[PDB]
Amino acid sequence: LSCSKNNSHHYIFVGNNSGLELTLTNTSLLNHKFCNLSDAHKRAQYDMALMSIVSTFHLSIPNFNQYEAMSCDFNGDNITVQYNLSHASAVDAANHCGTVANGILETFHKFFWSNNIKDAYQLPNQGKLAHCYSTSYQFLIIQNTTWEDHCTFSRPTGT
Ligand SMILES: *[C@@H]1O[C@H](CO)[C@@H](O)[C@H](O)[C@H]1NC(C)=O
Ligand SMILES: *[C@@H]1O[C@H](CO)[C@@H](O)[C@H](O)[C@H]1NC(C)=O
Ligand SMILES: *[C@@H]1O[C@H](CO)[C@@H](O)[C@H](O)[C@H]1NC(C)=O
Ligand SMILES: *[C@@H]1O[C@H](CO)[C@@H](O)[C@H](O)[C@H]1NC(C)=O
Ligand SMILES: *[C@@H]1O[C@H](CO)[C@@H](O)[C@H](O)[C@H]1NC(C)=O
Known part of the structure; x- marks a missing residue:
C-alpha cells in the first residue's frame, strides 16, 4: 500500500479522472535499473508526468x-x-x-x-x-x- 504508516505520500490531481500518487517508501516497486523510453509515446507520458509535478x-x-x-x-x-x-x-x-x-x-x-x-x-x-x-x-x-485507488500501488507492468 502507498498509504502505510511506514510511508509518506501525497496525491496530485492532473487530469479529469487521473493523477499521480507520490510515495516515499522503503519498499522497492521496480527491481530493474532501466527506463525504456524508446517509444515516443512512452517518452511523452514520462515527460507529461514530470511536467505535472514541476508545474x-x-x-x-x-x-x-x-x-x-x-x-x-x-x-x-x-x-x-x-x-x-x-x-x-x-x-x-x-x-x-x-x-x-x-x-x-x-x-x-x-x-x-x-x-x-x-x-x-x-x-x-x-x-x-x-x-x-x-x-x-x-x-x-x-x-x-485514480483518486479512488491512490492508496494501493498499481501493478508496475501488465501480464
Ligand atoms: C527506511 O530505511 C532507512 C535506511 O535503512 C532507515 O534509516 C529508515 O528508518 C527507514 N524508514 C522507515 C519508515 O522504515
Ligand atoms: C510497511 O508496513 C506494511 C504494512 O504493515 C508492510 O507490509 C511493509 O512490509 C512495511 N515496509 C517495509 C519496508 O517493511
Ligand atoms: C533500485 O533499488 C532496487 C532494490 O535495491 C534495485 O533492484 C533496482 O535495480 C534499483 N534501481 C536503480 C535504477 O538503481
Ligand atoms: C494516466 O493514465 C491515463 C490512462 O490510464 C492516460 O490517459 C493519462 O494520459 C495518464 N496520465 C499521464 C500520462 O500523465
Ligand atoms: C491504468 O490506470 C487506470 C486508471 O488510472 C485503470 O483504470 C486501469 O485499469 C489501469 N491499467 C491499465 C492496464 O490501463
Missing part, C-alpha cells in the same frame, strides 16, 4: 548537472517511475540537489507530509539559494492512478 509544485530545479538514479515501467498507458534516492546524508543530498526528486522532497518537507526530511544543505546557484534535502527514505515512487 503543480511550482518547482525550480537548479542545474548542477546532477542525476537521481531512476527506473520506470508501463502498465498500458499507466506509468510507474521509481527513484532510488541518494539523499541519506547532507553530502549525498548536496550531490543530488539539482533533481526533480529533490524538489519533491522539498515539497513534502515544506508542507509537513513527512517527518523524515531535513533541509540539509543550501548553496547559491545562479543568484538563487538552492536547498538540498536529506531523507532516510530509500525510494520515491510515482504512479499514474
